[PDB]
Structure formats: structure tokens, C-alpha cells
Amino acid sequence: QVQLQQSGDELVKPGASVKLSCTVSGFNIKDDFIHWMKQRPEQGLEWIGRIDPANGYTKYAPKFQDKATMTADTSSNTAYLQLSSLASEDAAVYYCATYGVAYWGQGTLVTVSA
Amino acid sequence: NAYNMSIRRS
Amino acid sequence: DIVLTQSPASLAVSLGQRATISCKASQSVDHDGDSYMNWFQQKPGQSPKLLIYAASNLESGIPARFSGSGSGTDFTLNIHPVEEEDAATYYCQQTNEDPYTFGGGTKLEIK
């Protein structure tokens, strides 16, 4: 009954920023961490980090510490992933997940233009 | 039930 | 960080037989008597689907044809029997230590 609905695909320009969203239904997001993952066909699946929506506390993988910002709003049961200063290697599918890591969103495609 | 153990909760 | 290495990278298995996929961790993923290794299935254009958590627990909604084994650094996913719908890429993931890490994937085909 839990659904994680991610925002639509985005074409982004190098040097720009983009903010992705993950709207959760059927689950109180204060009840668990929300995790963000990145997937590229060659470099595979990477864990970006997790946020605790109950207190705002964040933990990032070191390679994402000055690229990604995770936020959340219990008021709207929505988590956000802001990607800054976009570059070619940021083009990827981004996933959110919760309930441990059992339930995943459908993914958001970020493409970066030349 | 994967909530408790699909991540390590410490 | 923990590095996960899967073997083989790809395999083709005859319909109805057994298959095993291996995931080896560069450091232990055990803590307090549990092993924090997950297995995911992914098909093209879809999100990864959790199959097994904490090495050997079958996720709700997943067929019992899937099972997980192992501890410490050595883990396996067994499919028994393999069916047509199992054609997919399989990933292991450890959640014992930050950052969580994933194996490179094993693509399973049916023949």
C-alpha cells in the first residue's frame, strides 16, 4: 500500500541545479529513513545517502557530500534531492527508497545536455 | 518484514 | 568502504534448472549475529526489487524459488527452479557499513 512517486524526468544544463522529489503515500515518512540511489549503466548502483525525516539528520556517501543535498518535509510526506553544479557524470537514474530499503520509487531520469 | 533488517539499525 | 564482487557477471541457464549467483564482500558485513546483505532483481526500465534481506530472509511477495545463504564475506543467491520471468540483472547490496554499496550485477538469461 506504500507508494513512492518520484518527479518527472529532467533535461538539465551543465553548471545548473535540479531538485528531484519523492512523494510518499501510505506511509508516514517520520517513521523511517529515506534513501537515495544513483544508477548509471556503466558505474552501476550507488547509495547517495539517507535522511531521517523526523529530525532532518542526513548522512551522505563522501563522493556525494558537495553534490547532493537531501531534505524532507513531513508536512507533505515528501523527500527531495537537490543536485548542484550539474556535470556529465551526474546524468543517471535517481531512486528513493524506504521501509529499510524494501520499497523503491520508480526512478527519475536526469539527462545532461551538451 | 524487511524494515528491521534490510538495513543495520544502530 | 565495502567492495562487493559478483560472480559470474552473466550466465545463461536452462529453464527449470538451478542457478547460483555469488557475492563476495571485501570486508565482513556481519554484526551481532546478523549478516546485512540484500539481493535485488532488476528488469530494464524498472526499479530494483528486493528479493532477500539480511542474507537469508525472503521478502514478502517474492517466490520461495529464491533463497539466500552465507555470512561474513561470502554470500549466494539460489534460484530453484529458474523460470522464464527470472531473466533480469541481480545485485547484492551491503547495509552493514556506511556507505552502503552494491555489487556490479549479474545478468541472467534463459536458454
Residue C54 contacts A where some CB pair is shorter than 8 Å: no
Cα separation of C68 and C4, whole Å? 16
Written out in words, the top-level CATH class of the domain with range C1-111 is mainly beta
Give the technique used to solve this structure. X-ray
Check A45 against C48: CB less than 8 A apart. yes
Residue C41 contacts A where some CB pair is shorter than 8 Å: no
Q: Which three cell numbers stand for residue A10?
A: 529532467
β-pairing, A108-112 vs A10-12, is parallel
Question: From C97, which residue of chain A is nearest by alpha-carbon distance?
Answer: A61
Check C105 against A44: CB less than 8 A apart. yes
Q: Which residues in B lie closer than 8 A to residue C59 (C-beta atoms)?
A: 2
Q: Are the beta carbons of C6 and C104 closer than 8 angstroms?
A: yes
CATH architecture of the region A1-114: Sandwich (2.60)
Structure resolution, Å = 1.6
Q: Which residues pair with C50 in a beta bridge?
A: C40
Please give the full DSSP string across C8-41, using - where no structure is assigned. -SEEEE-TTS-EEEEEEESS--EETTEE-EEEEE
